[PDB]
Amino acid sequence: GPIRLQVTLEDAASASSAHVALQVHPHCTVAALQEQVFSELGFPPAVQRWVIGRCLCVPERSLASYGVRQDGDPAFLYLLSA
Amino acid sequence: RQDKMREEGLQLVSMIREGEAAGACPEEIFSALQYSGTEVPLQWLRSELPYVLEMVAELAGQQDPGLAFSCQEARRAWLDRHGNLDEAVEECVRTRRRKVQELQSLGSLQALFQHGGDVSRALTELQRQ
Question: Could you say which of A58, B12, B101, B109 is the most buried, measured as most Cβ atoms within 10 Å of its Cβ?
Answer without folding.
Answer: B12
